[PDB]
């Protein structure tokens, strides 16, 4: 739809891959850095979907 | 000092070891994006320049 089908997505991040036929919809943010990610981006994450 | 983006500044790095986790896994960088490799295998690939 104009202005985008957001209805739709998908996970851009986890920290690995998935087992064949595994599902995962978890929306716990995906660590890049030291510490926790504390329910916030950029503090040493960002969010996976 | 930092350049102009108009005259934006390039440096060669070559000849040396990196360690691009101690960049990736820094809090301060508000935006890491990467294209055509993954900001983690980043630091087990290998360039000539």
């Known amino acids: 739809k104009v202005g985008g089908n957001y209805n739709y997505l998908y996970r851009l991040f986890r920290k690995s891959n998935l087992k064949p036929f595994e599902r995962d919809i978890s929306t716990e943010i995906y660590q890049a850095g030291s510490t926790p990610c504390n329910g916030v981006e950029g503090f040493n994450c960002y969010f996976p979907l | ?35 055509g490799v993954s900001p983690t295998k980043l630091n087990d690939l290998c360039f000539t320049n």
């Not at chain 2, 440096?11 to 890491?32: E, G, H, M, P």
């Open chain 2, 1 to 35: 000092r930092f350049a102009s983006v108009y005259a934006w500044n390039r440096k060669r790095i070559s000849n040396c070891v990196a360690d691009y986790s101690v960049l990736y896994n820094s809090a301060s960088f508000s935006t890491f994006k990467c294209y």
